[PDB]
Nucleic acid binder design. Sequence first.
RNA 1: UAAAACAUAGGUUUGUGAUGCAUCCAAGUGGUGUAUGUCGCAAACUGAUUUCUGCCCAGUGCUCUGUGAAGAGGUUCACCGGCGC
RNA 2: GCUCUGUGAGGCGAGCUUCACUUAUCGAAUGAAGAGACCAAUGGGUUUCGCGUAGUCUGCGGGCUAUGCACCGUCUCUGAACCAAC
RNA 3: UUACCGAAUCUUUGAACGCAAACGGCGCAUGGGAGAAAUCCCCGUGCAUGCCAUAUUUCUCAGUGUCG
Lengths: 109, 102, 50, 245, 208
Amino acid sequence: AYTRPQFRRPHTYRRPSMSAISNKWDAFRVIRYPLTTDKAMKKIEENNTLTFIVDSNANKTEIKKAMRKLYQVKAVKVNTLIRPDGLKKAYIRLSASYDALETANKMGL
Amino acid sequence: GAFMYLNELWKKKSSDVMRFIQRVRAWEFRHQHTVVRLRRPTRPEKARMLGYKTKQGFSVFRVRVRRGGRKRPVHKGITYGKPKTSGVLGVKLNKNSRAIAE
Amino acid sequence: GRFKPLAIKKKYAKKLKQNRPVPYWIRLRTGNRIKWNEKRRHWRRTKLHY
Amino acid sequence: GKTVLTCRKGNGSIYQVHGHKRLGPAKLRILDYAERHGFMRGVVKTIEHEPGRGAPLARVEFRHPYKYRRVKELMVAPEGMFTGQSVLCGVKAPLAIGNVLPLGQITEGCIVCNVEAKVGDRGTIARASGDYCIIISHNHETGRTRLKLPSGQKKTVPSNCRAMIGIIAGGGRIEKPVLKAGNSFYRFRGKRNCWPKVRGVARNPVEHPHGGGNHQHIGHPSTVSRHAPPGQKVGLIAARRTGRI
Amino acid sequence: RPKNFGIGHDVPYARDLSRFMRWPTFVTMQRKKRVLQRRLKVPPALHQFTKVLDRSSRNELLKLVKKYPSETRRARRQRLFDAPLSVVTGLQEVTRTIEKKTARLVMIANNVDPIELVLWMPTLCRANKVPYAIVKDKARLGDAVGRKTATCVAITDVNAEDEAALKNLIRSVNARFLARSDVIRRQWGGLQLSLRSRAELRKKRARN
RNA sequence: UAAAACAUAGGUUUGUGAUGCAUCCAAGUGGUGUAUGUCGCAAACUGAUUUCUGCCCAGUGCUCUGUGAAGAGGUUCACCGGCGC
RNA sequence: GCUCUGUGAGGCGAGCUUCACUUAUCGAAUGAAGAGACCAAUGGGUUUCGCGUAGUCUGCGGGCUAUGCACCGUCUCUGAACCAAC
RNA sequence: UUACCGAAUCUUUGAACGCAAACGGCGCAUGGGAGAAAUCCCCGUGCAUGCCAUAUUUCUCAGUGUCG
Ligand SMILES: [Mg+2]
Ligand SMILES: [Mg+2]
Ligand SMILES: [Mg+2]
Ligand SMILES: [Mg+2]
Ligand SMILES: [Mg+2]
Ligand SMILES: [Mg+2]
Ligand SMILES: [Mg+2]
Ligand SMILES: [Mg+2]
Ligand SMILES: [Mg+2]
Ligand SMILES: [Mg+2]
Ligand SMILES: [Mg+2]
């Protein structure tokens, strides 16, 4: 009952087949330290935008979720760059409902 | 003494019956891979002399080897330096063919 | 130009922050040997061809 | 010495056929059961130029014998093979231009092209432009027809061998002088790194057996032996006679 | 809605291609290994395994072997706290029973991985004048002994109820082998034509 | 050293029907011309066209036309096995 | 040259070649895509395994050579197309 | 703080092996996470080839191989 010029192997049955904290990534590994340069101080007041060196392997969506958890605030956007030096740098802009100024000063800045 | 029969049956490799069995095999073995595992030795009595035992963890393999002398792999067949060290076709490998198959 | 694998950017980044004068305070340690950084690099001279 | 250019072409490095723009092999249809017991109608779809080749290739589109799909297939065209033509390959194909029918069923004396020497090999003799081979005999008792190869050369092949009817298209290429060194630049653009052909006497003594010397001349006969080792078998090879004929 | 299946009409419904299919190599080779050894001229020593005990006779004998099973591991242990008659099985044990001629019938299997294991055995029973029979499959001597294959079996002895049942079999057995031992040591086998080439010859002689 | 050389078109010649020809590879159911098929491929010489390529095949090149015997044996002697023309 | 290297039929000569054979081997084609047969044998033998004839042989069970029965064995100058109606 | 050593930690790689790779790229499966009007996002583990063993409650199969 073969109907191919060449044989093909049949389907045969196939059976389906320590760190206490495995997820080493974390809100605290993602975000590192806020940046306090005067390009960033222009953004906190003028753009409602916190600046952070953030883990270089972290991505944007993780940086949002990290700001939400570390500083309890929404990030309308987070456009990161990785610095020539190799640190990644997020400019996170806060939702208007969240001041970037009231929050940065709450942050000890 | 079944070994004694099976051992002298193989001492007659040139006998036309043994020459026929061997014929079909060499045919049969040409159409197989250079290495081929066997669930059993072709020569149970001979494999067992050599330490094979029908036990778990003993396995047998039939490894093919092209016959004839080595051709020394110099480029274009040229050889450099002294005339003694010339010669491509006729120098032989100084290694056994059971060795090369092992 | 713009193009860089990040692996190359991490390396120039590495050599960039490595391209710094020795700390002043390191020279003031006991038994200190170092003065100038012997591995200062300059883009116009030694090339980190990556 | 140093490796002769005749020997280097065998490395087939720089010396390989081009063929990026080549359409693929130009063969006859696979010798199906339908070829052997009937015929397959394929309509010619379009006559292409294969770069580097003289003869146009046709795009006959046979319907697939065993499945619902249509099988376009490419063969060097007999002259007069227009698009939309319905080719008929098979043992009881009608005897017409472009039809591919068993060689022993082709009438003696009729001229055929794209003949296959071995049965089923899909057409190897008489494929170059203008070329053809007259059938010069059948031998039904032993089933082997003779035929005259495009070179004045008789050859016996089985009648089960297919052949196409008619001259291969694009005949008369060679009649037109090339004139320009640049014109022959392009005929070999689609072929291979065959060209320009430096003369071996113009070469050096390392480069070629003929090379070197003050006046540029071959020093020994140019008619080399058949058994001459490669790198030596240059000049006229195993020549039976030389001279203008 | 009938379909024409002339060439160049309706596509065929998928007809079987087993005959022209390209098989896995081990398939092509076990097919060819079997073809190869019909059509070569086999030696009389090796052809004799092609000749074989008549099955109605075979079926009788394997039922006899089944009547004298070797004791199972469960029972052999249980016996030894202190053997039942059974067929000798095993090439080494069966070889003794032949040489010691305690064997009173022996059952070489037809097929064997190296026939060499047993190729000599028919000559060895013929020499000790032990009745012997070749039989179709080491798999059937297998199940007859509860092993998955048996190269040989030896009826060295039997209870009185089965004495004659063995004797007629011993003479229905050496009737075909041991009695024919002069014939068997003679028949070169093989050389069968393919029936694709027997018929071709049936017709070439038909035409002449 | 930009030529007068190389290329060139044109000319001729040689091989060759795929078991091929040339040819690579240490090696192979390896490779290149060849995805090709004599209007092709491979090899050479000459060097557009016009015109003509005489005589010489001597040389050279190419082409073509194990088994007996002796011996104790080692062995020995003998017979059969591409050239020359 | 030997080997690879088998098989039948010859003839010649003291294992040599013709001729067929085909399973080695080789080449080719192929997506291994349709080979042969049924048309029947100087064919086969495990469900066909068996009978009958003459010759010979016998471990008395049958064998073997020839031979014929059976049985293996038998059917008929560009269109569209598939996804079946035992 | 020093010295030593048992417990761990040991990032990207690398034989490197899930697939790649001048890509800090991309998977499939499994569990987790955050999250969110699910999609996305992070994470852990498995997932190379070859071979041996085994199918211990004896896996599923393939062969005009051998038979029955
Ligand atoms: Mg960016
Ligand atoms: Mg510079
Ligand atoms: Mg760079
Ligand atoms: Mg020069
Ligand atoms: Mg030279
Ligand atoms: Mg000159
Ligand atoms: Mg000259
Ligand atoms: Mg010039
Ligand atoms: Mg001229
Ligand atoms: Mg002249
Ligand atoms: Mg990897």
